[PDB]
Recover the amino acids of this structure.
């Protein structure tokens, strides 16, 4: 009845050593969300910067613009990955 | 897994509102938990510039 | 420095090891002066090593131009259309052979900075972390301070 | 004013323990001083005769015809 | 004045409590020391810097084999605060010319003359 | 002395195709050694930089500064050679695309060195209606920019 | 002037290709750009040590965060995975924490299991059977 | 006037480089530049890919029909490409459907047709043949080689490798250059669909499973400008997929896409291609 972590929320972790004791086999299949645990699907520059700040819960300073020296230092074709 | 690129990216960096009842609690020991969840330091995706902080509602 | 230089991600050209390996070096263009003391080690490279080199990789087409140059060059062209022009000016034959094998072994991608030392295209197998991994659910999907 | 923490005391103490065991293993030599005497005089003398010998064998290198003539290749041309 | 420090001989006389503490025998002691520099010779006097150069200990954390003879022990008593001493114990024999390459000095202090990389 | 801006009216383009939009005209005109300073012409040159030439003329007739009359001569002259020399059918259908002012070859007067300051005035007129001024970006544009920056971000310094 | 210097545009331009992105006259004037370009190269080499350092504290922040999700603390996880002869490093554990959180959950279960065997072994002291995951694989 | 020559030569060539960057010339094809031997470089294209061709047949694989027509427009002052490209694209369509029917047996054949029409699309095949030196060997009329022409020459090269050395070696060729283009791409980046929910509903009718209930599993930030939803999709109160989104409809459609990847074997955890 021992569980080293409460195997309830992410995966059901079942540790094992092998008979030689050299490799640790972990067995951990996924824990599905139960159907009981779900809800059914329900069916001017000043005031604009205050309105965006209060909308997105950030300060005001990232809504003021920046000069051309900062707009043109920017890399417009940045390298992509994955 | 098996999400598309955009909803995986949305799902990872999405920010979570936490509730935190401060009755009979010390203010600094609430402040430590609140501070960790405000910086995003409770996420393994954390980075300073990546802006992954959350919301803490202390009642 | 890294902020002055451009950078890129580590890549291949057309998934160059997956199916088969393709030599990314198409053309070499040696240009060697006949009379000229700077292309001496180029001369002894064409005489000794360029036929052995041209047989060790037949997907490479090699042009020895042998004009009156005052600096000899090797011009590697790559399958993705990159051009690396390097000099073989006042080099020994062995230094030219390590340079030509250096150009053979590499690909046409830039020698600008590489950002990460790796490139998975499928980094996650068990599903990437989102903040609702590692959280338990509640009965009927309730949230804190939800009465019904 | 600077004060002593518990890190500094525990560190200082584990250096004292390494020191005490150094005291232990220096307290039982395998030989007495009469037994050790001249027990490695030969190897020390041959070692210094090697140092002496490499000191007294210093001289300019050999100069060759082939190097001096091999400078003439700087005007090797094709035909 | 800061001078060179002699250390009296009662400091270097073992007690049977210490034979119970460490693993030593006063009769039939060990032949070879393993000495390891673990504290810099900088901010130390120049004589201790020299003794570290003689003993062959200019790298930190690199073991060196010495004889357990009173001359080498005298130099070790000069710099005993910078070094660490263990007995070189040898579970099997000293290596013959067959086992000369395939040795490994382990961290216990023992020198094993057959060093496979396979588990037991 | 360099004189590259006068030459710019000499570019001859190869003739177009019938499945191709009509290229607008470009009329590079300038005046050299205006006795005025280059930084006082910057306000007059800056004033008219996207206006139609009738709005530019109209704004420069009622300005008090010395350079306004000089720029109005440059723009009436470039409206003339716009129509005569460069096949612009309507006098009205021009706008100022470029109006700058460089420094000219100044003189030095020993009093105690004091410069007699000269300037030029460079105007490119472009055939067509003046381009619509840039609208101030709304909260929809700011919100989409912010969210697109949030969509852009990656787990950094990992696989 | 018998031989005055012809090839001086190129020495200047060897410095100024590194300064093309600075601010102020540092991108233009050679006297200013030399002090800033030298000073940028000194920072550029002292920052190799800080790149290594800051990646490692970044990994400890990510392993700390992800192991606090499973109740463990960082010293408990790293200590009791050393004690299991799982010689993974911080880079790999942080990357498993992000991309493979079931393997990270099972590693947190293996480290807390080993932590409890360390507790129960160092509680009931004396000769007893060792824990199952407490056993070590001897290499000879 | 500083006497000397070397700084004026170096400065002369840097002025030449700023002339090339300020006003670069239009790109000329490679056969109209120095160091070109066309026959030697067709043989190099053969040995580069590690196979053998009958060299005349590969030569006709690079000769378009536009080139002959503008060439005979230039005569007045060669076998075409189309037979080999017909055979090559017929073969590569049926062998790509062989591979993708064998390694994805649960796909609908509409999806196999959209995968195969991705791996023989103009974007993929034109991206492949600009890095295999096909474009440099194409005898085309105009430069750069327009993408329909270069698609035709690429499948002509497949047809020439077919008549050279049989169906198995071309199967390995198509495997190693066209199939490796779907590494790192998700299924619905290749087979685009609108209404994935109706498609998932129809597929679940074909397995004789009931229609799935979309059912909100987890959420956050519901009354903000940055919500997050995980909609689940249950079948007889067991979920088949669950996906996130910024709104509820977005997450529901995306959970339908997760279920469609799961029905078809095209998950992110699928066994990779065995090369």
């Amino acid at each position: 009845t021992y569980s080293p972590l409460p195997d309830d929320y992410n995966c059901n972790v079942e540790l094992a050593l092998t008979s030689d004791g050299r490799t640790i086999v972990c067995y951990h299949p996924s824990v599905d969300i139960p159907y009981e645990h779900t809800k059914p699907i329900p069916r001017e520059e000043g005031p604009m910067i205050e309105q965006l700040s209060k909308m997105f819960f950030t300060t005001k300073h990232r809504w003021y613009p920046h000069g051309r020296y900062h707009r043109c230092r920017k890399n417009l074709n940045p390298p992509k990955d994955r | 897994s098996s999400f598309s690129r955009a909803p995986q990216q949305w799902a990872t960096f999405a920010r979570i509102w936490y509730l935190l009842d401060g009755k009979m609690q010390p203010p600094g020991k609430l402040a430590a938990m609140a501070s960790i969840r405000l910086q995003g330091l409770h996420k393994p995706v954390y980075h300073a510039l990546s802006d992954c902080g959350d919301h803490v509602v202390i009642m | 420095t890294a902020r002055g230089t451009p950078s890129r991600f580590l890549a291949s050209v057309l998934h160059n090891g997956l199916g088969r390996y393709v030599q990314q070096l198409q053309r070499l263009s040696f240009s060697v002066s006949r009379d000229g003391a700077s292309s001496r080690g180029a001369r002894e490279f064409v005489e000794r090593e360029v036929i052995d080199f041209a047989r060790r990789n037949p997907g490479v087409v090699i042009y020895v131009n042998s004009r009156p140059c005052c600096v000899p060059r090797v011009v590697a062209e790559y399958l993705n259309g990159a051009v690396r022009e390097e000099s073989i000016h006042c080099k020994s034959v062995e230094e030219i052979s390590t340079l030509v094998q250096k150009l053979a072994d590499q690909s046409g991608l830039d020698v600008i900075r590489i950002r990460k030392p790796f490139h998975t295209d499928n980094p996650s197998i068990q599903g990437q972390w989102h903040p609702f991994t590692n959280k338990p659910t509640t009965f009927r999907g309730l949230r804190p301070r939800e009465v019904q | 004013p600077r004060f002593v923490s518990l890190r500094a005391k525990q560190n200082m103490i584990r250096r004292l323990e390494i020191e005490a065991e150094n005291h232990y293993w220096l307290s039982m030599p395998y030989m007495t001083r009469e037994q050790e005497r001249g027990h490695a005089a030969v190897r020390r003398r041959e070692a210094f005769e090697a140092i002496k010998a490499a000191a007294t064998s210093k001289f300019p290198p050999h100069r060759f015809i082939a190097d001096q003539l091999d400078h003439l290749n700087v005007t090797k041309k094709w035909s | 004045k800061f001078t060179r420090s002699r250390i009296p001989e009662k400091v270097f006389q073992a007690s049977p409590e210490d034979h119970e503490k460490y693993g030593g025998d006063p009769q039939n002691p060990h032949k070879l020391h393993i000495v390891t520099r673990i504290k810099s010779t900088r901010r130390r006097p120049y004589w201790e810097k020299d003794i570290i150069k003689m003993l062959g200990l200019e790298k930190a954390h690199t073991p060196q084999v010495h004889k357990n003879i009173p001359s080498v022990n005298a130099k070790l008593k000069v710099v005993k605060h910078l070094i660490r001493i263990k007995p070189l114990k040898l579970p099997q024999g000293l290596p013959a010319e067959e086992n000369m390459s395939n040795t490994c000095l382990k961290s216990t202090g023992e020198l094993v003359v057959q060093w496979h990389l396979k588990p037991v | 002395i360099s004189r590259k801006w006068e030459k710019k009216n000499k570019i001859v383009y190869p003739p177009q195709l019938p499945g191709e939009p009509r290229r607008p005209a470009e009329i590079y005109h300038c005046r050299r050694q205006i006795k005025y300073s280059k930084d006082k012409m910057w306000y007059l040159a800056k004033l008219i930089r996207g206006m139609s030439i009738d709005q530019a003329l109209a704004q420069l007739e009622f300005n008090d500064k010395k350079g306004a009359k000089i720029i109005k001569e440059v723009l009436l002259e470039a409206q003339d050679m716009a129509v005569r020399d460069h096949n612009v059918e309507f006098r009205s259908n021009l706008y100022i695309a470029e109006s700058t002012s460089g420094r000219g070859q100044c003189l030095k007067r020993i009093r105690g060195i004091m410069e007699k300051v000269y300037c030029h005035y460079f105007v490119k007129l472009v055939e067509g209606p003046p381009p619509p001024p840039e609208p101030p970006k709304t909260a929809v544009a700011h919100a989409k920019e912010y969210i697109q920056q949030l969509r852009s971000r990656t787990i950094v310094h990992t696989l | 002037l018998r031989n005055r210097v012809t090839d001086r545009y190129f020495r200047i331009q060897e410095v100024l290709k590194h300064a093309r992105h600075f601010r102020g006259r540092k991108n233009r004037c050679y006297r200013l750009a030399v002090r800033t370009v030298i000073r940028a190269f000194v920072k550029c080499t002292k920052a190799r040590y800080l790149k290594k350092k800051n990646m490692r504290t970044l990994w400890i922040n990510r392993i700390t965060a992800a192991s606090q999700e499973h109740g463990l603390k960082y010293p408990a996880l790293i200590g009791n995975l050393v004690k299991c002869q799982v010689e993974l490093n911080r880079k790999v554990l942080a990357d498993l924490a992000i991309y493979e959180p079931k393997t990270f959950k099972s590693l947190a279960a293996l480290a807390s299991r080993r932590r409890h065997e360390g507790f129960a072994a160092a509680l009931g002291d004396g000769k007893e059977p060792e824990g199952i995951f407490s056993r070590v694989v001897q290499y000879h | 006037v500083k006497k000397g020559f070397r700084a004026a030569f170096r400065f002369q060539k840097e002025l030449e480089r700023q002339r090339l960057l300020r006003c670069p010339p239009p790109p000329v094809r490679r056969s109209e530049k120095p160091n070109w031997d066309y026959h030697a470089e067709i043989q190099a294209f053969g040995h580069r890919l590690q196979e053998n061709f009958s060299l005349d047949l590969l030569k006709t694989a690079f000769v378009n029909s536009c080139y002959i027509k503008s060439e005979e427009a230039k005569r007045q002052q060669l076998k075409s490409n189309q037979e080999l490209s017909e055979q090559g694209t017929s073969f590569s369509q049926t062998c790509l459907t062989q591979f993708l029917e064998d390694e994805y047996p649960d796909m609908p054949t509409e999806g196999i047709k959209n995968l195969v029409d991705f791996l023989t699309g103009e974007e993929v095949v034109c991206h492949v043949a600009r890095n295999l030196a096909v474009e440099q060997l194409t005898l085309s009329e105009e430069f750069p080689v327009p993408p329909a022409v270069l698609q035709q020459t690429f499948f002509a090269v497949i047809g020439a490798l077919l008549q050279s050395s049989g169906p198995e070696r071309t199967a390995l060729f198509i495997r190693d250059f066209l199939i490796t283009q779907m590494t790192g791409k998700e299924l619905f980046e290749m087979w685009k669909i609108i209404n994935p929910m109706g498609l998932l509903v129809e597929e679940l009718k074909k397995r004789n499973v009931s229609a799935p209930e979309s059912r909100l599993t987890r959420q956050s930030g519901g009354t903000t400008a940055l919500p997050l939803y995980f909609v689940g999709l249950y079948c007889d109160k067991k979920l088949i997929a669950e996906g996130p989104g910024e709104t509820v409809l977005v997450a529901e459609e995306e959970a339908a896409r997760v279920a469609l990847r799961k029905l078809y074997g095209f998950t992110e955890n699928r066994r990779p291609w065995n090369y």
Notes: Chain E has one domain: 1-120. Helices of chain E lie at 16-21, 46-55, 70-78.
